Design an enzyme around this catalytic site. Structure first.
Site, PDB file in Angstrom:
ATOM      1  N   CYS B 105       0.884  -1.195   0.000  1.00  0.00           N
ATOM      2  CA  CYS B 105       0.000   0.000   0.000  1.00  0.00           C
ATOM      3  C   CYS B 105       0.919   1.241   0.000  1.00  0.00           C
ATOM      4  CB  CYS B 105      -1.039  -0.036   1.118  1.00  0.00           C
ATOM      5  SG  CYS B 105      -2.445   0.965   0.632  1.00  0.00           S
ATOM      6  N   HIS B 125      -0.016   1.470  -3.492  1.00  0.00           N
ATOM      7  CA  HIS B 125      -1.365   1.977  -3.734  1.00  0.00           C
ATOM      8  C   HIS B 125      -1.324   3.017  -4.833  1.00  0.00           C
ATOM      9  CE1 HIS B 125      -5.347   3.779  -3.116  1.00  0.00           C
ATOM     10  NE2 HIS B 125      -5.614   2.590  -2.589  1.00  0.00           N
TER      11      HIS B 125
HETATM   12  C1  72U Z   1      -3.100   2.114   2.075  1.00  0.00           C
HETATM   13  O1  72U Z   1      -3.513   1.188   3.135  1.00  0.00           O
HETATM   14  C2  72U Z   1      -2.036   3.048   2.354  1.00  0.00           C
HETATM   15  O2  72U Z   1      -1.020   2.780   2.956  1.00  0.00           O
HETATM   16  N1  72U Z   1      -2.294   4.181   1.712  1.00  0.00           N
HETATM   17  C3  72U Z   1      -3.522   4.123   1.212  1.00  0.00           C
HETATM   18  C4  72U Z   1      -4.166   5.112   0.543  1.00  0.00           C
HETATM   19  C5  72U Z   1      -3.544   6.346   0.341  1.00  0.00           C
HETATM   20  O3  72U Z   1      -4.137   7.420   0.218  1.00  0.00           O
HETATM   21  O4  72U Z   1      -2.200   6.239   0.171  1.00  0.00           O
HETATM   22  C6  72U Z   1      -1.507   7.492  -0.094  1.00  0.00           C
HETATM   23  C7  72U Z   1      -5.454   4.859   0.143  1.00  0.00           C
HETATM   24  C8  72U Z   1      -6.041   3.631   0.376  1.00  0.00           C
HETATM   25  C9  72U Z   1      -5.320   2.600   1.004  1.00  0.00           C
HETATM   26  C10 72U Z   1      -4.073   2.914   1.423  1.00  0.00           C
END
Ligand code: 72U
Ligand code: 72U
Ligand code: CL
Ligand code: CL
Lengths: 187, 187
Positions: B105, B125
């Site tokens: 992510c 991500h």
């Molecule tokens: C995820 O679990 C993470 O580490 N970031 C993340 C985003 C995000 O905005 O990353 C910049 C969105 C959705 C899941 C995750």
């Protein structure tokens, strides 16, 4: 008024089946209470992840009722849920008020133990089918998520996102479920 | 000799991305240590699930090294991992010994912060791509799980099972990963 979810957390619960619905429901703006069956102390899950509940079940019961009661699986967790008079009373009240009851993997076997939702179509983990079907009190389904009457069921750790999103759709609608789903990078 | 995994758990970690790999790795017979960045005390994850670590990172470091070091995501968790001198030293040692490093992510952004694995193909991500790519030190991939050199990356909560199973395959082989996968009821 945000919807409210009670997630009952027992020793031996499947930690993935607990955490995935808690997290996804919170993403949906649902107020989730993780309630420890045994008390307020941390809970050792099936694969040894230790989760600190938000409250004891005893205390959480007093803030009822909830829009959904959620029963994670894990065989030993489900057995603990099945043996609990507190859980029986909570599920009976939820059924009587026509509220949603959600259970995953072996979790639905606690519905059988507590005589909840007889006649509903249900699924379980494949290895929990025979237990669930003892007496023929439910109709079995192989759908990854099933919903009949008050009762929303699902099969395993690998169906936990689908189960969670179905709960979200039931409480908050299809558009919110879709919004919550997109950032998860589901297949 | 069972393989051993270090999962570094910081405030703000994505609880699904922490628990899914811990659980699936334990299903695979991997000895997993959930190590608290801040100490031995419970950790409040991104969606308020509170997880009690097996050990502080300080203590877990002394039982190194590990077959895999795992960095969950969660933006604020990853930021905490990124700011940690302890994490830097652990990842540098792991890289120097040619051990597996796994991150999901926004977790991979801690690799950037600590100058780990430059030149590797990586995913993140989608919303963490620009941060990861600042300087062009990695080559970006949209694969749900990516593996290049020492570095195994993945995209989100919804790719956590695939990420976990890839770690299992890397450490214990394809046949064990397949065995572990079947009972999960993945799609
Ligand atoms: C995820 O679990 C993470 O580490 N970031 C993340 C985003 C995000 O905005 O990353 C910049 C969105 C959705 C899941 C995750
Ligand atoms: C699941 O998390 C559960 O509650 N039961 C279960 C089995 C099992 O043997 O059920 C009887 C197998 C795999 C996942 C689960
Ligand atoms: Cl189990
Ligand atoms: Cl986050």
């Amino acid at each position: 008024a945000s919807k409210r979810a009670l997630v009952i957390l027992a020793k031996g619960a499947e930690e993935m089946e607990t955490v995935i619905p808690v997290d996804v429901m919170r993403r949906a703006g649902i107020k989730v209470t993780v309630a420890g069956l045994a008390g307020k102390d941390p809970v050792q899950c099936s694969r040894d992840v230790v989760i600190c509940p938000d409250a004891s079940l005893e205390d959480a019961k007093k803030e009822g009722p909830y829009d959904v009661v959620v029963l994670p699986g894990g065989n030993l967790g489900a057995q603990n849920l099945s043996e609990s008079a507190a859980v029986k009373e909570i599920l009976k009240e939820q059924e009587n008020r026509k509220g949603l009851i959600a259970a995953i993997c072996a979790g639905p076997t606690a519905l059988l133990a507590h005589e909840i939702g007889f006649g509903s179509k249900v699924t379980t983990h494949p290895l929990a089918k025979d237990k669930m079907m003892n007496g023929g009190h439910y109709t079995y389904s192989e759908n990854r998520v099933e919903k009949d009457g008050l009762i929303l069921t699902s099969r395993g750790p690998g169906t936990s996102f689908e189960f969670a999103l179905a709960i979200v759709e039931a409480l908050n609608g299809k558009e919110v479920a879709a919004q919550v789903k997109a950032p998860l990078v589901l297949k």
